[PDB]
Amino acid sequence: ISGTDEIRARAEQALTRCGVDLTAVKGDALTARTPLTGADLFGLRAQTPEDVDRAVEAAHTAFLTWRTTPAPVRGALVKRFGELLTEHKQDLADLVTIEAGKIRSEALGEVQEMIDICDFAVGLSRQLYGRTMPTERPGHRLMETWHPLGVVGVISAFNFPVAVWAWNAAVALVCGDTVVWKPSELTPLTALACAALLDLAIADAGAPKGLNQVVVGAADVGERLVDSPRVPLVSATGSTRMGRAVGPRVAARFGRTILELGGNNAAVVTPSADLDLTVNAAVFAAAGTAGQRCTTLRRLIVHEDIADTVVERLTAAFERLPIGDPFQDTTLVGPLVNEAAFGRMREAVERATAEGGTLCAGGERQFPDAAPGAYYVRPALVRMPAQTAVVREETFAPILYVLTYRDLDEAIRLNNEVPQGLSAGIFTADQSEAERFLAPDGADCGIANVNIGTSGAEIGGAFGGEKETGGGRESGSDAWRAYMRRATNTVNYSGRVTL
Amino acid sequence: AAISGTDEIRARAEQALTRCGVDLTAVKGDALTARTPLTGADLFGLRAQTPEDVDRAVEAAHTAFLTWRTTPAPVRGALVKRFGELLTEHKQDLADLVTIEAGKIRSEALGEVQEMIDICDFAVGLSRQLYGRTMPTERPGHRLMETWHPLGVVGVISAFNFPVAVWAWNAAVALVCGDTVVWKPSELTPLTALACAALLDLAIADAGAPKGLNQVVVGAADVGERLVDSPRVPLVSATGSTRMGRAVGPRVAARFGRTILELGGNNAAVVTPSADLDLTVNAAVFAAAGTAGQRCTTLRRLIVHEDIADTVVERLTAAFERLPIGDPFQDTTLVGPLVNEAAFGRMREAVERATAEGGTLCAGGERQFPDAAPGAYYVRPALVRMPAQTAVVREETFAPILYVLTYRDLDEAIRLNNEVPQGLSAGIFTADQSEAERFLAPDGADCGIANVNIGTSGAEIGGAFGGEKETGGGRESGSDAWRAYMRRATNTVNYSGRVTLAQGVDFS
Amino acid sequence: AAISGTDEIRARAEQALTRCGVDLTAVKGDALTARTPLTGADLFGLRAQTPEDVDRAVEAAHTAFLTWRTTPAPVRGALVKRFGELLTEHKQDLADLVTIEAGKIRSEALGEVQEMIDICDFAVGLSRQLYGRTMPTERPGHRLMETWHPLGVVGVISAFNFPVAVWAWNAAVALVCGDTVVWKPSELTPLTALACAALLDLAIADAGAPKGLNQVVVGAADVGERLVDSPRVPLVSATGSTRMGRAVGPRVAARFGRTILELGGNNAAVVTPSADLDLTVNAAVFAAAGTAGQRCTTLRRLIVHEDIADTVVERLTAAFERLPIGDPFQDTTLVGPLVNEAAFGRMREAVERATAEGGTLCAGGERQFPDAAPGAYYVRPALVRMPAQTAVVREETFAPILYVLTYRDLDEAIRLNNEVPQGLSAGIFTADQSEAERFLAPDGADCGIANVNIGTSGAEIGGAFGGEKETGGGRESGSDAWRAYMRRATNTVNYSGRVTLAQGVDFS
Amino acid sequence: ISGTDEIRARAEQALTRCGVDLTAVKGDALTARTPLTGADLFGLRAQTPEDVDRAVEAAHTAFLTWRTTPAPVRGALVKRFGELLTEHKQDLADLVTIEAGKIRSEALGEVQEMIDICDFAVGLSRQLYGRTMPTERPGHRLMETWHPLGVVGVISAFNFPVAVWAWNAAVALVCGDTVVWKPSELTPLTALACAALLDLAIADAGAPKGLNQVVVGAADVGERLVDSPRVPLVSATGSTRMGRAVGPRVAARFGRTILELGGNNAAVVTPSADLDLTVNAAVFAAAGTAGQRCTTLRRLIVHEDIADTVVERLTAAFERLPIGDPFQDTTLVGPLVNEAAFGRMREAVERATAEGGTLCAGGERQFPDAAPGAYYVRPALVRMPAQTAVVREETFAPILYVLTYRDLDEAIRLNNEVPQGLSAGIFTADQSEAERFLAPDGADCGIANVNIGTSGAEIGGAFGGEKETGGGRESGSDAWRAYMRRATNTVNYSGRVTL
Numbered sequence A, D: 001i002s003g004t005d006e007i008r009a010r011a012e013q014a015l016t017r018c019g020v021d022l023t024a025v026k027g028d029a030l031t032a033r034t035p036l037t038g039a040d041l042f043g044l045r046a047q048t049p050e051d052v053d054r055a056v057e058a059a060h061t062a063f064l065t066w067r068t069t070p071a072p073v074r075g076a077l078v079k080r081f082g083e084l085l086t087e088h089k090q091d092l093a094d095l096v097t098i099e100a101g102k103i104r105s106e107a108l109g110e111v112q113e114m115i116d117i118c119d120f121a122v123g124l125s126r127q128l129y130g131r132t133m134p135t136e137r138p139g140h141r142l143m144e145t146w147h148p149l150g151v152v153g154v155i156s157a158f159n160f161p162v163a164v165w166a167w168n169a170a171v172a173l174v175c176g177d178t179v180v181w182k183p184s185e186l187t188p189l190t191a192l193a194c195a196a197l198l199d200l201a202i203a204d205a206g207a208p209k210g211l212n213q214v215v216v217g218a219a220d221v222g223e224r225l226v227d228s229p230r231v232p233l234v235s236a237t238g239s240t241r242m243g244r245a246v247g248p249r250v251a252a253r254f255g256r257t258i259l260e261l262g263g264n265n266a267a268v269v270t271p272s273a274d275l276d277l278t279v280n281a282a283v284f285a286a287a288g289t290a291g292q293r294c295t296t297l298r299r300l301i302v303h304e305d306i307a308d309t310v311v312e313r314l315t316a317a318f319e320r321l322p323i324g325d326p327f328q329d330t331t332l333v334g335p336l337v338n339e340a341a342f343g344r345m346r347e348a349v350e351r352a353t354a355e356g357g358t359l360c361a362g363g364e365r366q367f368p369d370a371a372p373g374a375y376y377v378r379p380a381l382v383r384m385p386a387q388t389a390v391v392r393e394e395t396f397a398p399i400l401y402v403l404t405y406r407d408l409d410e411a412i413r414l415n416n417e418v419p420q421g422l423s424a425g426i427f428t429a430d431q432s433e434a435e436r437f438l439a440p441d442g443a444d445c446g447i448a449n450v451n452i453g454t455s456g457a458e459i460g461g462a463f464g465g466e467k468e469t470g471g472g473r474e475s476g477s478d479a480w481r482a483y484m485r486r487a488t489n490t491v492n493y494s495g496r497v498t499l
Numbered sequence B, C: 001a002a003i004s005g006t007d008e009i010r011a012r013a014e015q016a017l018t019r020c021g022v023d024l025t026a027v028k029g030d031a032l033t034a035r036t037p038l039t040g041a042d043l044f045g046l047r048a049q050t051p052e053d054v055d056r057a058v059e060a061a062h063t064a065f066l067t068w069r070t071t072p073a074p075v076r077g078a079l080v081k082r083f084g085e086l087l088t089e090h091k092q093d094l095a096d097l098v099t100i101e102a103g104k105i106r107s108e109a110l111g112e113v114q115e116m117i118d119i120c121d122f123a124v125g126l127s128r129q130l131y132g133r134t135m136p137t138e139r140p141g142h143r144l145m146e147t148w149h150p151l152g153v154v155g156v157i158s159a160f161n162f163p164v165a166v167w168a169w170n171a172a173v174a175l176v177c178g179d180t181v182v183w184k185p186s187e188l189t190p191l192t193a194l195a196c197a198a199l200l201d202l203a204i205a206d207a208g209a210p211k212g213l214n215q216v217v218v219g220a221a222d223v224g225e226r227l228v229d230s231p232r233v234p235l236v237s238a239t240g241s242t243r244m245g246r247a248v249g250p251r252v253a254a255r256f257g258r259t260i261l262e263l264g265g266n267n268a269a270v271v272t273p274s275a276d277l278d279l280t281v282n283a284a285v286f287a288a289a290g291t292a293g294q295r296c297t298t299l300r301r302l303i304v305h306e307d308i309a310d311t312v313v314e315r316l317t318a319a320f321e322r323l324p325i326g327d328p329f330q331d332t333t334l335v336g337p338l339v340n341e342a343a344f345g346r347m348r349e350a351v352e353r354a355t356a357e358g359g360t361l362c363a364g365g366e367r368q369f370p371d372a373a374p375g376a377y378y379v380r381p382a383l384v385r386m387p388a389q390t391a392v393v394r395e396e397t398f399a400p401i402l403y404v405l406t407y408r409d410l411d412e413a414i415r416l417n418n419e420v421p422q423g424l425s426a427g428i429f430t431a432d433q434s435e436a437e438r439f440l441a442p443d444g445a446d447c448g449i450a451n452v453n454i455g456t457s458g459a460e461i462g463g464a465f466g467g468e469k470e471t472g473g474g475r476e477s478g479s480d481a482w483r484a485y486m487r488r489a490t491n492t493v494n495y496s497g498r499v500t501l502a503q504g505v506d507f508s
């Protein structure tokens, strides 16, 4: 396993290359850390709640200029940012691996997501389409226009520490908004590097300095951002608890929220499923990112006629998964984020067996003496007699519960029964089963796929889910509309009014 | 003036209800009462639903939804078409009930029923659209699309002032979107809702549609609160005063539900030096005094350039003095009564406070013929010239009070428009091309509706209706407002038989 | 079988025309004749328009357009709503005329009239949409939008086989788009057009709309040609055989006009090894034999996997032998007559040539009860097994002939589908998820309509209807097909008071 | 004036820098030329009609691969092309000035149009939106999809020798089409440079070589392209004669055309017009590019109450226009393209005075001895008593006809009376007049603007016009739909059919 001194030097190098002034951000209030060894990297300055208020003030002042800057000019800034991200892709990806623990190929993919949404937002900057339409009034004209909203508060999580902010910031900036970003306390360095690169693009563009600001600190900092009367939109990604904080209190001040609170995602495996395809897809979606994606596969609903062979094949695969240092290309499963994540995983597996389940593979901590402060775990495969309490309540860990069904409508009911609703997949060769799964009475999730897993999503699609996932959408399609305000304009050019 | 008697109003209400298919014996009772602002009197008592009845109604609506959501949308549109035909057939009867319960003049009552018919026609068109998207995917041998699906039971909370059109907007759209509806009408206007529901129930019977597609729950606040709190109601659409917002918005958010909120406006019009004054005075009177100042879109603030402020006030003063106030069934009437005594009280307190904050009462504000209908509150709309936009101006009163403010620079007029906490509609009267465009620009008026040379009530079925800030953010009726009634799904379909292998490893 | 007599048909036609408001005395004459495929006989003579009359009709339609184009689209929609109500009222009468002139069975005639009603409902929705766009501009202090405007007079050329629905698609959409219409119906089906126009003229009178919004011109080819050549007709919508294409397309292009061309299809269905054979045989019979093979969307080629080809042919042979052929007014009839003797002649020549090109006639092809109605051509649909897709298979005959081809690899079936010069509709019958998606993929079926587990007539109001290659490229009815009836404008609005100075020089 | 030897060396340098192999393209069949001096630069190889057939075959073979290449991957090629255009912007702009004669600032702007449509097309590559919509059939699903069309024939003109092709090629390539480009015989070098840069992007992307090909030659080459049965779309830009060739014969083989055949564009000047704004706007739109834009202002319809002062101000401005070498930054008006252009201009002015008009300014050839083979002319200002034959028939030269009106509806009628219909503008301070001009009974053109001239257009808008302009649209909004084919798909998953 990579040494902590080596990791710290890599982090400082990447930060410096991305334009971070290490002397200016170091301090004693917070500590950067790495799940690779569990070690603290170095101390950081923190922001206070008054700092948040000052940051919102600076973002709002920037917004007053940015909102009348033509959207194609705002797109030119985002185009330049994408060029800088391309130039520093490896440096940023190193920070993503160091702080989030994800393997390098996934860290590079996450940085590429940033570049791709930049390119998409540059296209959007000439669109942001409203409508023109007839009016019933003679000698009048009617249209619908879209306008910049204001300061956007972005709350992101540890597991996608750069892509979620990029989704929000690339779209928000092209929409004429400004951004105040509160990253996860677990992943501040990625955010500092992102912000420094964007500040460089802002300088090159001659744009206002307050277009984007990062606030580093604990829960009190994020609370102050959520409560700000000058933040009309809060975009929050995290686990379910973040909804009951953020949603209601922003609603209480008549603000808007985009909430994406994770999922408890299932795939249905029908009798005609290609089992090699299904096993590969399930392994990648259940074990990838050590089960720490919003879209992670956590429930496999398998037809009773193939359930035994599917569990046998998955058991063999799970026993073969390469666990290790996420900087090694041979690794598929890196570490969990911290000790509490490991403890919660162990507690879920213990509860599952007490609720009648059978642990088929995985669950054991790997090479603890190689890094006693880090938690490398083999993903767990648990066969369950029913969708019990532990199955319905998501644990943010690599645990794949296997359930059986006979009738497709019951598989759909099992998919839909849980409180979350992010993504779902069906593996089938049957044309009708595929369509039934995607029909109005099929899977109820925001993402519903055929013959690809629960992480099957891309930039051009709206990303998000239903029920306790929170209802928000980000990235593609017309998700941008949540960052602007609609106006309906009637124009009288006839000189008369009804008497 | 001569005001209809309560007994004459009751007889007309009962005739209208019977013609619309309501069983008077079944809906009458002793728990609540129907009433009329025309005299302030109770008409007759009504049976009420309990909170338990609300839960039963929601569960029955959900059962109906389980069938309706797989009924093809064009077939769902056929039901709405049939309902529109019944509304057309009973337009006069329903308009009678709107005048009786809301107090609005006959022509406005007819226009509100026509709004229902028009949104039915619009929703029938939508029933073949409800467009999602197909789009490229980056993955070879895959397809990508976005689809829209029926959401579930929609709870509709409506207000006294548009007792049929708001529900119609929500129900016509929700039904073609595959949703079902539980409607809590205003405690002040139950009869209009009973008549609407009876006509829709006839359409449902004619169509062979599920019986639980729409239900009216008649009750007080505990009935409405139970509807808002139901875990089986994924969307609550609420129209009412600002206080409905902090109620409904956070509560529904707390259970991961969706809301559409339209909580009224404090709407302003800017009058520039080049304004056509005949056009402007007519538009301002209609928008300030119409519906006795009880529209969400009512004109409450007039922001007039200092060069023409004196002549505009003179003309408005004369016009307000000529307003015909009386029984809303008489064709001569332009201004009917306020809804109840509490509305009159709040109006008088606002006018008194405006004069204490430095304002000058230019016209109106007095109760008319109080002895002719002692329980009813007919008032002349008030015109108040204000030296600044003080607290009483920024706090909207649901009453016909028009505050006149002066400005010099257009950016000051825009700031005056935007400074209030509401944000429903705004208008600018100008002959100047650049001023009109500046008012509508991103740094212009901040409202959900922003118009040129038409007042703050200038809106129509085809546009999205709603506003910003404390108005609540929701949109109803036109454009793609229907998307709030459905859930988006993003679908990736793999037909390649292959998946990307993580780290190149094949686990098979 | 028992076939209605010409005199009984004429009496029913005259009753239907009178009920729809046609003045029989005014339209009768000696220039042309109405006829019926049920017996092949002339019904009665009609007055005809001259080419000069066409120019007069176009100029009158243009005068109407000058008023209609500034009539608000929702008001234009109200006219179309009224027309839909009259169509609903006279559905049976109009369907009688469709059966009499086109020869299609009662249920199909009723369905075609219902298509008219449905597109009216759709167009009423469109009348509040006709959406353009608003979008950012790169220029500070400017605004940018895209608007859609009424185009002008639309010339509609329709065919005998859908004598009312095609005009309805064009007219309902054109009218709400602010256009006016001059309609040249098939020389074979004038009475349906006279009845439609009389009902629309009543709607126009009820609405107080301009009288020249729609006119029917009754004539031969010189009347149609004058319409196509008119410099006052910016859009010609033409439905007919392939030969209508090289006529209309280039001529209208030569005067910088626009065309919508839908020139029929040579439509195929692929039957894969996993196809549900009961579903497939029923769908194939309905799509091949329905309307006596005289739909633009008729199934003419069946591309069947070699593993199931023998059993599919056996089942189709038995089904074709059981088809009930007879008078289309009898409820027992599924297959009515071909339109005329020339259609029968071309069918016999194609079947004879197919057997000479190596094919095997499996069922049908014979004229039924020739002595019962000697001037009418009732035929049993032909089923022909072909060893290859030879010339006669690639050249479509407007007759019920189903050619059966075999394949092994799906890419071969797709090539067989795509190899013909027409490109209207295609279908695949399969239980396999990947085959269904492959058929619809960019390298799949090349047609304008491509379906899974539904035949080649699987289309509906909400979709754009039309095809590719020699089908002609046009789209009608649903989605945003309406844009072909309007002109796009891109509007930049400067409110900044400034312009970019070329080379920085201020010439003022 | 720049010397021919200097110009030739600049052209060869720019070509080489853009990757052109000078030995491979030089020949004896055609000659490159420059309007700066009228001189021939050097000889070029030409293609034969069989070469066109071979090029179409190669483009079609490329199309069979490109049409299943995911559109976002096709967008990555266009993104790379835009980067190469940015890198070689000055080199390409030099070739545009040398061949088209336009001043360097306009040549740079035209190359920037290419870069901007590349960025827009990269956004489109994740959109290309069809629809999903309800079906009336129980247990069915309905959608509308868009598919690559095939080989696109592009015919461009001398006056925008790179931007028009870029509009067509960036959109076509993202739409999965391939391109065969026949540039103007007058401007082959720009096309060779564009094609070489795109071939470099294709090589970097690993894309098929036949995605884009240039065919250099005379009318027989373009005719063979237009007639090809494997070219389903022809996009043609040029003067009106190109419509009656291209439109009807492509229609005769059931192909599709996009036609943009220029304009006879007018601006209305109302009594409340800002006259400083109007004079500047009119001078730029009438005299820019020496009157050789499709969007050039050719008709000024001025209210009678201000007509005298507007003509006086325009006369003064026209007398002050800087005519000269388009490589000199002081130049506003460069040369006309060739002697025939000058002759046609002179003939139009002579006809205008015979039809009752008064030449107020301009029309004289400038410094002929400085370059006897080049035609530098001062733009002509002609006051006309009515919209006579010469006013209604466009001459591709800087001639601005001044007409008077009193009632706005008559100004609109004068605007609309001509056979072309590309662009129109109104200069007014009056809110109602502005809206009346843009209303359904207002200006009939494809582009209709307020307080900006007839060249007021940009990437995000659909570009094109009505009537004899030809009806086509290019560039923005959903112009891309003309490059693809619509499919309507009904999917039955219920297992049943109506009996």
Ligand SMILES: O=C(O)c1ccccn1
Residues within 6 Å of the ligand: B162, B165, B166, B295, B296, B297, B298, B457
């Ligand atoms: O305030 C208004 O103008 C309004 C409110 C609801 C429904 C219709 N109109």
Ligand SMILES: O=C(O)c1ccccn1
Residues within 6 Å of the ligand: C162, C165, C166, C295, C296, C297, C298, C457
């Ligand atoms: O061929 C068809 O199926 C068709 C043609 C025109 C109108 C309706 N249907």
Ligand SMILES: O=C(O)c1ccccn1
Residues within 6 Å of the ligand: D160, D163, D164, D293, D294, D295, D296, D455
């Ligand atoms: O005439 C114009 O302004 C034009 C023409 C083609 C491309 C860009 N601009």
